[PDB]
């Protein structure tokens, strides 16, 4: 799946207009919570490296780290969801337009299929 040359793709556009047709990630998305947790860990490591009280040195700095991580994570999640939606859209369209390559196989039940039996002895 190389979508770099996919037709009608604006060159440097992070989120196209059609991506607005998709449900946005919820603010309590577990991935957003993990991005906030990553920002919190960055704040703790920042306090530790500068030889400051790790948990309670700069509350404004830790808040800024968490907020920036959540902001970027929200936009990244939107782009990720949009790209997966494009992949599924293209796959379904291709299967629809090429019926001879994706045939409808015959329904067979197990009572009329012979599988070899291998005893465990």
């Amino acid at each position: 799946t190389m979508m770099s040359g996919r037709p009608g793709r604006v060159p440097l556009q992070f989120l196209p207009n059609e991506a607005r047709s998709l449900p946005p990630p919820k603010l309590t998305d577990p991935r957003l919570v993990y991005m906030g947790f990553l920002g919190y860990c960055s704040g703790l490591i920042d306090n530790a490296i500068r030889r400051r009280p790790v948990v309670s040195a700069g509350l404004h700095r830790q808040l800024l780290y968490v907020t920036s991580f959540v902001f970027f994570g929200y936009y990244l999640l939107k782009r990720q969801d949009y790209m997966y939606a494009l992949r599924d859209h293209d796959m379904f369209a291709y299967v629809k337009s090429h019926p001879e390559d994706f045939p409808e196989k015959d329904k067979k039940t197990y009572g009329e299929i012979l599988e070899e039996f291998h005893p465990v002895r």
């Binding site: 037709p7 060159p11 440097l12």
Partner: protein, 53 residues
């Protein structure tokens, strides 16, 4: 990798110098202008694989 700034902005930084059939000074034609023009018109939008075949 390739960031198509020219296409986004419509600038034409270096596209004027890529092919023989593209607006030479004083309307001087390339030696193979017709062949290149035909090959480019054949393969436009079709994509690399289909153009190759």
């Amino acid at each position: 990798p390739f960031f198509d700034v020219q296409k986004r902005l419509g600038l034409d930084l270096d596209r004027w110098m890529t092919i023989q059939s593209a607006e030479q000074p004083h309307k001087i034609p390339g030696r193979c202008h017709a062949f290149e023009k035909e090959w480019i018109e054949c393969a436009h939008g079709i994509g690399g694989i289909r153009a190759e075949k």
